[PDB]
């Protein structure tokens, strides 16, 4: 069925080029609110314990996620076995001496793969014993995503959560843009008579997008929709390069 | 496309579902002139069952499985030229 996956991905490239000519986007409009997405979280290869507990924190962060083990899983048959499992997103974590550095999000049914550098992390497994996470299907909040690339990353980044939470649904997850650095925290709260009081729990980090390829994770022949430009002579002069 | 089916679905598209031109776009033959010879000799199945009439419209959900049968001369010489003729399953 390699001719089937090639024909469907060639149809996908045509649909993306046609939508970019006549500019929820094209890749997600079939399943914007119907199917609750499932997320497979993996590490790089022979992970460290600190990276593994960070991946456990990420699996606990956004629901319908399993933390699949990664040792001697070859990447192409990994992603096609994930396709035959028929889940939706893959999330790969690359570390450096226990500090995680790369978070690759791949919406693998012929969809986009974004890649994020992941700068200042804080792990609740090595700070705070306060109990379990809340694990309710959360609310999401986003701060000044106004660029077209910002709308694209907020689409592929909020289309991995549980669709349609309730009013009582407690935990909120923030994605704040502070000059092309998506800062992530997540909180629970109550409503006081004075107002609202938040409680920081779970991870915190900030991620900078650096590649956003139209193909799947394994190919490396994927046409680049966007990647940053580190070495132009106007790099530090604008945002969403 | 909803209302602009007035102009595009013509002879050049309704004949593009034909098994000879789908064969030629799948590069299973040199041209139509011998693709019709193959599928009239009865070497080419689609799905599980063999198809012989060279006016068949392969549908959308059957274009993936229009392949040569087992135990045929052209499948044998294809696997011979590639030198991968796994002769357990008949060819």
């Amino acid at each position: 069925m390699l001719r089937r996956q090639a024909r469907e991905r060639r149809e996908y490239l045509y649909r993306k080029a046609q939508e970019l000519q006549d500019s929820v986007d094209d890749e997600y409009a079939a399943t914007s609110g119907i199917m609750d997405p499932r997320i497979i979280v993996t590490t790089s290869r022979d992970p460290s314990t600190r990276l593994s507990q960070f991946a456990k924190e990420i699996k606990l962060l956004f629901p319908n996620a399993v933390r699949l083990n990664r040792g001697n899983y070859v990447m192409p048959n990994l992603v096609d076995a994930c396709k035959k499992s028929g889940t939706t997103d893959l999330v790969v974590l690359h570390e450096h001496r226990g500090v995680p550095t790369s978070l690759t999000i791949s919406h693998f049914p012929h969809g986009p793969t974004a890649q994020f550098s992941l700068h200042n992390v804080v792990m609740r497994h090595d700070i705070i014993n306060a109990g379990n996470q809340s694990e309710v299907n959360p609310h999401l909040i986003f701060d000044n995503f106004t660029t077209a690339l910002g709308k694209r990353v907020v689409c592929i980044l909020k289309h991995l959560f549980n669709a349609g939470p309730k009013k009582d649904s407690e935990r909120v997850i923030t994605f704040a843009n502070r000059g092309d650095f998506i800062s992530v925290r997540q909180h629970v709260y109550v409503r006081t008579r004075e107002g609202v009081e938040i409680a920081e729990v779970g991870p915190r980090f900030e991620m900078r997008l650096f590649e956003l390829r139209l193909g799947t994770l394994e190919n490396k022949d994927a046409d680049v929709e966007w990647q940053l430009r580190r070495f132009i002579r106007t790099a530090n002069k604008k945002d969403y390069l | 496309k909803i209302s602009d089916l007035e102009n595009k679905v013509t002879v050049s598209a309704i004949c593009r579902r034909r098994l000879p031109v789908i064969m030629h776009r799948l590069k299973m033959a040199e041209t139509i002139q011998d693709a019709v010879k193959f599928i009239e000799q009865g070497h080419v199945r689609v799905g599980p069952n063999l198809i012989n009439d060279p006016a068949y419209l392969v549908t959308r959900n059957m274009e993936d499985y229009v392949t040569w049968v087992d135990n045929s001369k052209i499948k044998k010489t294809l696997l011979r030229y590639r030198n991968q003729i796994d002769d357990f399953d008949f060819s």
Partner: peptide, 19 residues
């Protein structure tokens, strides 16, 4: 050529492939 290799379509046949 890597893209054509990843879409090789393993059932191609011509008259020139006999030797």
């Amino acid at each position: 050529l890597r893209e054509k290799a990843k879409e090789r379509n393993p059932d191609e046949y011509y008259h020139a492939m006999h030797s």
